[PDB]
Paper text:
Native amine dehydrogenases (nat‐AmDHs) have recently emerged as a potentially valuable new reservoir of enzymes for the sustainable and selective synthesis of chiral amines, catalyzing the NAD(P)H‐dependent ammoniation of carbonyl compounds with high activity and selectivity. MATOUAmDH2, recently identified from the Marine Atlas of Tara Oceans Unigenes (MATOUv1) database of eukaryotic genes, displays exceptional catalytic performance against its best identified substrate, isobutyraldehyde, as well as having broader substrate scope than other nat‐AmDHs. The two‐domain structure of the MATOU monomer is similar to that observed with CfusAmDH and MsmeAmDH, with a largely N‐terminal Rossman fold domain (residues 8–158; 309–351) and a largely C‐terminal domain 159–309 comprising a seven‐stranded beta sheet.
The first structure of the amine dehydrogenase MATOUAmDH2 was determined in complex with NADP+ to a resolution of 2.32 Å. The crystals were obtained in space group P212121 and featured four molecules in the asymmetric unit, comprising two dimers and permitting observation of open and closed conformers of the enzyme subunits. Electron density for the backbone and side chains could be modelled for most regions save for residues 189–193 and 190–193 in monomers C and D respectively. The cofactor NADP+ was bound within the cleft between the two domains in each monomer. The monomers that constitute each dimer (A/D and B/C) in the asymmetric unit presented two distinct conformations: a more open form (subunits B and D), and a much more closed form (A and C), where loops had closed over the active site containing the NADP+. The closed monomers show that the major contributions to this closure are the loops in the beta sheet domain, most especially those between residues P240 and G255 and Y171 and E190. A superimposition of the open and closed forms shows that Y176 and L180 have moved into position as a result of the loop movement and consequent active site closure. Monomers within the structure are representative of more open and closed conformations of the enzyme and illustrate the profound changes undergone by nat‐AmDHs during the catalytic cycle.
Author numbering:
A (entry chain D): 8 to 189, 194 to 351
B (entry chain A): 4 to 351
Amino acid sequence: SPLRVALYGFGNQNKEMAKMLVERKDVEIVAVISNKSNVGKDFGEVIGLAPQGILVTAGLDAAETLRTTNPQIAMLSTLSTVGDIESQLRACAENKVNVYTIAEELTFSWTSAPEKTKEMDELFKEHNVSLIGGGFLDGACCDMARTMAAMMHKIDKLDGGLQYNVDHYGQVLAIAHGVGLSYAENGPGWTSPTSYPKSYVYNMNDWFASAFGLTVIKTEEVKTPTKAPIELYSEAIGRAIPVGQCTGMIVTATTTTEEGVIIVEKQVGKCYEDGDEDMVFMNLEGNPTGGVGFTMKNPPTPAMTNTIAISRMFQTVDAPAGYITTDKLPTMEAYVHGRL
Amino acid sequence: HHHHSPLRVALYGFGNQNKEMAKMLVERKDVEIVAVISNKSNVGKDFGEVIGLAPQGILVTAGLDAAETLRTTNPQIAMLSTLSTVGDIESQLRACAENKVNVYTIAEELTFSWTSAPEKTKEMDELFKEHNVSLIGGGFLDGACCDMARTMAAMMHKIDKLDGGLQYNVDHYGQVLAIAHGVGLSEEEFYAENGPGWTSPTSYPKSYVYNMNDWFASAFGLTVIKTEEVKTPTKAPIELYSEAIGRAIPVGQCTGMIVTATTTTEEGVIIVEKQVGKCYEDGDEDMVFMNLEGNPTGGVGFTMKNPPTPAMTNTIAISRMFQTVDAPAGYITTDKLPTMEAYVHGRL
Ligand SMILES: NC(=O)c1ccc[n+]([C@@H]2O[C@H](COP(=O)([O-])OP(=O)(O)OC[C@H]3O[C@@H](n4cnc5c(N)ncnc54)[C@H](OP(=O)(O)O)[C@@H]3O)[C@@H](O)[C@H]2O)c1
Ligand SMILES: NC(=O)c1ccc[n+]([C@@H]2O[C@H](COP(=O)([O-])OP(=O)(O)OC[C@H]3O[C@@H](n4cnc5c(N)ncnc54)[C@H](OP(=O)(O)O)[C@@H]3O)[C@@H](O)[C@H]2O)c1
């Protein structure tokens, strides 16, 4: 019988994920949960398809829907933090439903959220199911670099990066980045060892430290404004940015290690001049010397987030019970013809 | 984790690649070098002294005596870094197989030799099967090209086209390899009968990209209709100097060669790979690129700029040692292996 799959959340990501999972003949969508949006309608009609024979169910009824529909996995595409997804995780664990989530933090949440991660580990262990996640950060950043790093004899430094256009993420995300502003205490740009939530690059640094078998001393984030040598216009905050005014934000996560290996990753959200593009880069310094690195220009991150998730489904079902970080998994399941 | 005896490793060949591979394997505490074979070069000297190191207690042995050396030294694997073709390495493969020694080779063709050399590959498969050992290879083409793309391709829902590429400086590969890529030829000389540009259904050996195409077709579970190669000379808008042929290359004279391998498939998937070997002008760099077209639609690709390919060839090989020993007997293409063994601190 095909894998029984729930879509937990049905916004931008799981709408697109649904189109692909409908085509997959090794999968059967058994449930699609939203909060309030589209809640009476057939999920296929929502996304421009023929009726599928399954209705979008409500957030409040999640636990009952997961009990009666008997999914082996829920694709949790709701929120970013172990705290904010806790309620959805609990509904899954209590009904013996495995989870792959695209929640950024769950790339590696052990140090950013120690107690909430421990709780979710123990809960999934108790009901004998697995929690895994990270989406784009899991597959396109960490797993790509894990393959590349096999070709290193000695790593002294991992120097990695993620660049996105923050003007295309709405207000709220623009406000959380220094767009419009100019290091004050109540401005993001102030940071401390206790500040929460941590950046995506914080969780990626800990993923690498785990994969490379390193011992973390400290991961510190340093938040720095971006500027342009010319006047920009922001269509996010609706104002010109004069020269020397903040256009966006870099979070640089620096991990020091008892082995002397340095891990530096930059998260860059800014408005973009001529020539700026969305980017992933990973570079390894050591031996081989002079830099072993890859770049991805203009990655279709939204679609790739969903396919990474799809590549982890059977692995998540088959993983040991508990919170399993992706460094403990094999590579994303290989592309093969004949699944559609 | 209980102690395992160190892997017993032979270096079969001892030129540019295995000299550098030796320096790294000496540092690896999970490995014991048990033999280093050359043809004639350095035969009789201690392999450590050859490569600027303290005496290791192992002398460089001769090509003709390979079978005896592999019999008395009892290696579990031979790192075969000699020649490029399943035909030309046959005699070294036979020495290994008959002494139950597994092989990882950097022989370009053994990325995927099944269609470029059907009968010789079948023979080597059956020989390794009979002696219950594994033949695996491809070096830089295996790990940095095919395996990197295999990870990236997991992120595809549907692949319509793979568009891939490899660029290297042939002026740094000696006179013979420069001549094989047509450096210093006029275009007309380039396209003369059995010149570098000449191409036919009977042409042999095939390009590296030919074998990579078939690796992808195997990995993606596709059925090959035809792979054709098309050869094109490279030119430069200014005069270059070639160290390899030791003279100026006038404007419009061939600076090297592009081999484009195009594979069609019963599934409608197209696989196109370019091999570019030429003399560089200012701003030319060594490159790998792989791009996947389909769904996701917006272009799923990576580029590697300025890879240290010689050292990466060796580390790829090192990442395959335990896998090769562990693999089922026979000729095992790397699409049937897991990813290159992950980097982990504390092996040195
Ligand atoms: N890993 C990556 O690189 C990556 C990339 C893309 C997205 N993400 C993250 O993934 C998350 C989802 O993104 P998206 O674009 O799909 O978001 P979205 O469009 O905001 O969709 C959220 C969906 O989840 C539902 N939801 C929220 N809270 C819920 C709850 N308690 N119970 C049930 N359903 C609930 C929403 O219902 P309503 O419509 O009724 O609110 C909606 O259906 C975000 O946190 C985003 O940052 C990660
Ligand atoms: N897959 C990849 O990415 C990749 C990359 C680089 C190289 N390669 C290939 O690897 C091969 C070797 O490369 P290289 O740069 O190390 O070459 P090299 O400097 O020519 O060394 C080759 C070694 O093999 C020895 N040898 C040759 N035939 C032998 C035989 N029958 N028995 C024993 N030893 C033998 C040679 O001995 P003598 O010095 O005494 O003649 C030499 O020690 C070539 O085919 C090259 O094209 C592949």
